Design a protein around this ligand. Structure first.
Ligand SMILES: N#Cc1cc(Cl)c(C(=O)Nc2ccnc(NC(=O)[C@H]3C[C@H]3F)c2)c(Cl)c1
Length: 288
């Protein structure tokens, strides 16, 4: 599917993705204003060959993904400037949960439904032999009060059929506070590593994405802000000692134990996304 730059009418900037920026456009070829609203992710004009290789990979992954809980791929636009492809995706009306939740007091049952939907989209992603590597509330988008979709796949990678993990590099932009100990220490990203990130995401939902309760805030309170290059090493140490993010206010005990099960040190002791779907359906049923 092809989109024309001449028919794209910019409304506002939505935010910063991974390789570039996301903007809100109205694709209006008729010029009457009845055109559809699109979210266009563009690669920055000054990006090197390393980011351009990863950007093409992001588009290839999104194109091959088709799920109700994964952001819909609409097409691509011919970007004459920067000489790259602009990723055209569906506009999710309510936005990220990190922005929506601190302003809208959402019930426990609805939060548990979102977690179930995240697991539904993630199990499909894993069945397609892909890892997300960036599962967080800022990347989970809301369509309506009952529908959730996974948005940013900038760090998503394909795990080969034979292998069970993917070896990662030493990067500054890595969401370390959402990462399992095997990602920080051995630089290995398993399917079980995404489950750890879900637990951290579930923690964010229960806190209603309160920035003073966020994982970088709580972990740096335990690490300390003056530890040189040893922030990640100190983070690895406390996780090895069994220290975890605290139980959120008004969060049920069994739900916190499920969060702690997603946060098991040994990756094999962690439930798969397919294991979490019947569980979260039952948990949501109890609180609805
Ligand atoms: N970090 C990060 C980060 C930054 C951005 Cl921009 C995105 C993203 O793709 N956001 C989108 C995409 C489509 N619609 C909205 N919808 C809205 O923004 C609705 C509020 C109204 F504009 C937000 C993601 Cl998934 C992660």
């Amino acid at each position: 599917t092809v989109f024309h730059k001449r028919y794209l009418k910019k409304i506002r900037d939505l935010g910063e993705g991974h390789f570039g920026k996301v903007s809100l456009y109205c694709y209006d070829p008729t010029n009457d204003g009845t055109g559809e609203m699109v979210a266009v992710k563009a690669l920055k004009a000054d990006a090197g060959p390393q980011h351009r290789s990863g950007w093409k990979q992001e588009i290839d992954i999104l194109r091959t993904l088709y799920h109700e809980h994964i952001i819909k791929y609409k097409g691509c636009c011919e970007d004459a400037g920067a000489a790259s492809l602009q990723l055209v995706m569906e506009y999710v009306p309510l936005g990220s949960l990190r922005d929506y939740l601190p302003r809208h007091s959402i019930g426990l049952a609805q939060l548990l439904l979102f977690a179930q939907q995240i697991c539904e989209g993630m199990a499909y992603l894993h069945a397609q032999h892909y890892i997300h590597r960036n599962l967080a509330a800022r990347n989970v988008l809301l369509d309506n009060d009952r529908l959730v979709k996974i948005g940013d796949f900038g760090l998503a990678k394909a795990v080969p059929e034979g292998h069970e993990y993917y070896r990662v590099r030493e990067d500054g932009d890595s969401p370390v506070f959402w990462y399992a100990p095997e990602c920080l220490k051995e630089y290995k990203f398993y399917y079980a590593s995404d489950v750890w990130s879900f637990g951290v995401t579930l923690y964010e939902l229960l806190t209603h994405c309160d920035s003073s309760q966020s994982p970088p805030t709580k972990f740096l309170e335990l690490i300390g802000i003056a530890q040189g290059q040893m922030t990640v090493l100190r983070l690895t140490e406390l996780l090895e000692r069994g220290e975890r993010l605290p139980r959120p206010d008004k969060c049920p005990a069994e739900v916190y134990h499920l969060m702690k099960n997603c946060w098991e040190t040994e990756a094999s002791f962690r439930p798969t996304f397919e294991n979490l779907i019947p569980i979260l359906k039952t948990v949501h049923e109890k609180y609805r």
